[PDB]
Amino acid sequence: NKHQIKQAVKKLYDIDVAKVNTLIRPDGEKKAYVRLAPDYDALDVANKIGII
Amino acid sequence: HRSGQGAFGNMCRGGRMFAPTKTWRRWHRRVNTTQKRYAICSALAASALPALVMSKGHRIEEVPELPLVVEDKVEGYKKTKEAVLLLKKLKAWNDIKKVYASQRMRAGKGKMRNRRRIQRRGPCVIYNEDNGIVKAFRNIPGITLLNVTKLNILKLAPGGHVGRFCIWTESAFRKLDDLYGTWRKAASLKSNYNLP
């Protein structure tokens, strides 16, 4: 659910989520556009999860 | 590809064959007991004759007597080195040596149907009682053992040709006279049988 993602992203990455938007891809896997609450820089936490 | 080809017919690709071979073919031909006996009486008879055994193809030029009857010490044997040395001294070994020369490849589809190797029929050793003669002789190529009370027509005259080189034992050779009888005395080990 959008609820299950929010409580996962909150617990995995010590952050909070403003809203979640979910689409299922043509590939069959689900993609989640996890809009963070604006008291967190997504670029500074994208570096924390370890993407570059 | 198959859409509109042709299925039913002996000539059609895919298809069945003409008159498909059935398993209720009469595979087995039964022979009369009297006729069966008068194959073995004739087969043993040609075995004694020297000319027929050489015409059959056996190297018996140097064999002692041509009903090669040996002692009952031969039925006590348990090793092939004992069985070899006997066939050297009876001078039957040149026939075993001939079987080794005849060990070659089969020609045809038999080689992919568990009939790979073909060799020649060597001397036939007929014994009364087994105390190891079969163990001692079975490993030598060409030699087929026989019990005297159970003599086979497929083994005494292989191919349908008569005069396979028979090596007898002492006790084996005397029991013949009672198995098939003589002409004044009927068989005692057969319920009703005279020689033809």
């Binding site: 299922i24 891809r25 043509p26 590939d27 069959g28 | -």
Partner: protein, 50 residues
């Protein structure tokens, strides 16, 4: 159509991921007999069922 069911969209999702060529390290194997992908499924030619 645009209006899909989750079962049909899952069916189409599988038939996309099956419609890719062979990896070119598969033909360098020992007991290798595969030249190309025989079950490749074009969208003009073969119409996927349904």
């Amino acid at each position: 159509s645009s209006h899909k069911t989750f079962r049909i969209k899952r069916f189409l999702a599988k038939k996309q991921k099956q419609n890719r060529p062979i990896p070119q390290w598969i033909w360098m194997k020992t007991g290798n007999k595969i030249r190309y992908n025989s079950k490749r499924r074009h969208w003009r030619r073969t119409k996927l069922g349904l």
